[PDB]
């Protein structure tokens, strides 16, 4: 515990950066910590992740499923959804965008394909994802004049899709789901530029989540315009057992 006077605001920030004397520093490591193997960590972790606080999470998820028509109404008006909160938002976005959103859009326009991105995976790439966007939306290929002089073909092709899709009917052809938009390979500038120019296209629905507490530093005013986010807090204290396998936990 800190021997502080303040805890909140800059008052607790400046007051908690004390220059602690070297005589009052404890030399404690993991050497006298308990020795734990991998399998018992996995067993205890899955047991509390499937039993501890499970009834309040189930109840709370039963409240926040009532927000699904409001989310759909936000998506039809051109707003991208960004979800944030404490805990895993993987299962929420899968259930909303698969069980609910695609059948509702498909029946209202008379299923809709759902690309699902895993930003917790460090090997998520913009060129592979855009080749699949090409595979799903079949855009027209760039002319020689449209390639300029060693330009990025992905960005120029998406800009050509932007000034193609402005005169198409405004109906959702693709639902594009981004788990963990602020993970390691997905937070970089080119991939965010790609999704901003994709979010300009009204005919693609953008559903994304973030996990980092400093994540809104990723977007300047142009990118914030292009995303056009409506923010929604979904805090549920989930396990996050899928993303945790992509980091090393035994270290």
């Amino acid at each position: 515990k800190s021997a502080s006077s303040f805890l909140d605001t800059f008052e607790g920030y400046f007051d908690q950066r004390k220059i602690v004397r070297t005589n009052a520093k404890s030399r404690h490591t993991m050497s006298m910590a308990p020795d734990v193997t991998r399998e018992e960590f996995s067993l205890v972790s899955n047991f509390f992740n499937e039993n501890f606080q499970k009834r309040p999470r189930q109840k709370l998820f039963e409240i926040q499923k009532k927000m699904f028509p409001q989310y759909w109404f936000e998506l039809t008006q051109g707003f991208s959804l960004l979800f944030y909160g404490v805990g895993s938002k993987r299962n929420f976005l899968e259930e909303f965008a698969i069980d609910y959103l695609s059948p509702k859009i498909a029946y209202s326009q008379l299923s809709i394909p759902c690309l699902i991105l895993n930003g917790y995976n460090p090997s998520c790439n913009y060129r592979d994802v855009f080749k699949e966007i090409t595979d799903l939306l079949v855009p027209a290929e760039l002319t020689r004049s449209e390639t300029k002089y060693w330009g990025n073909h992905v960005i120029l092709q998406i800009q050509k899709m932007i000034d193609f899709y402005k005169n198409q009917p405004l109906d959702i052809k693709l639902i594009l789901v981004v788990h963990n938009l602020d993970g390691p390979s997905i937070r970089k500038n080119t991939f965010q530029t790609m999704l901003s120019f994709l979010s300009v296209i009204r005919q693609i629905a953008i559903v994304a989540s973030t996990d980092h507490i400093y994540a809104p530093l990723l977007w300047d005013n142009m990118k914030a315009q292009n995303y056009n986010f409506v923010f929604h807090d979904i805090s549920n204290f989930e396990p996050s057992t899928v993303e945790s396998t992509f980091q090393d936990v035994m270290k």
Binding site: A3, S4, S5, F6, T9, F10, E11, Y13, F14, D15, R17, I19, D182, R187, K188, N189, H212, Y214, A215, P216, L217, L218, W219, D220, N221, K223, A224, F231
Partner: protein, 226 residues
Amino acid sequence: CLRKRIIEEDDQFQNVAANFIHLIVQAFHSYTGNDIFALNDLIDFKWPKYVSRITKENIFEPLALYKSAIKLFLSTDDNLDLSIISKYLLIASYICSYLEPRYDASIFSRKTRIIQGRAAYGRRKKKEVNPRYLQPSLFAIERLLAIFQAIFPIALREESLMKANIEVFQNLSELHTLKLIATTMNKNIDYLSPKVRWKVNVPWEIIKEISESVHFNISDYFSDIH
């Protein structure tokens, strides 16, 4: 301009042009050095303003014509909107770069202590060298937000301090995009890494005019340190 001036108001005009060129040379040779091109540019910029002050008294009098247009020979004259959050974030960035973090609590702290504890004592000495002359230091985001909240202008359910919402981080992202602030890396920058540090990227003459546009007293924070 001279041909319109002499009808509105060859050798004598040649003497007038030569005297103007000699006056330009003696006024700005220390500025230009022995540069033909810079003096040519100065002659081009100052000749019509010199011609416009020629009257029927000044034309045959070099000293009177020089006294009519002396302000052309006293200054070189070689010269040619931003948000409140972004201005105050620039001021906080300049404070974070050019002041030490250990003396923050002696400058910005103002809260009444329920719990007993001494605050910072402040610095004993004054620096020999102005820190604003040197390179800026590198800071963290949380320190910048803390000083921004400490310097931003202002019951039971009000909480008049401004917290770091979407707009603060968005203005910070524009502030980096314009490179009014900079980082250690510029290519393939990871915004979310804790190892990435930030510095201010404006000189003192820019941050002074920005602080004059918002009536902030930034020079008070450097008058008592050096």
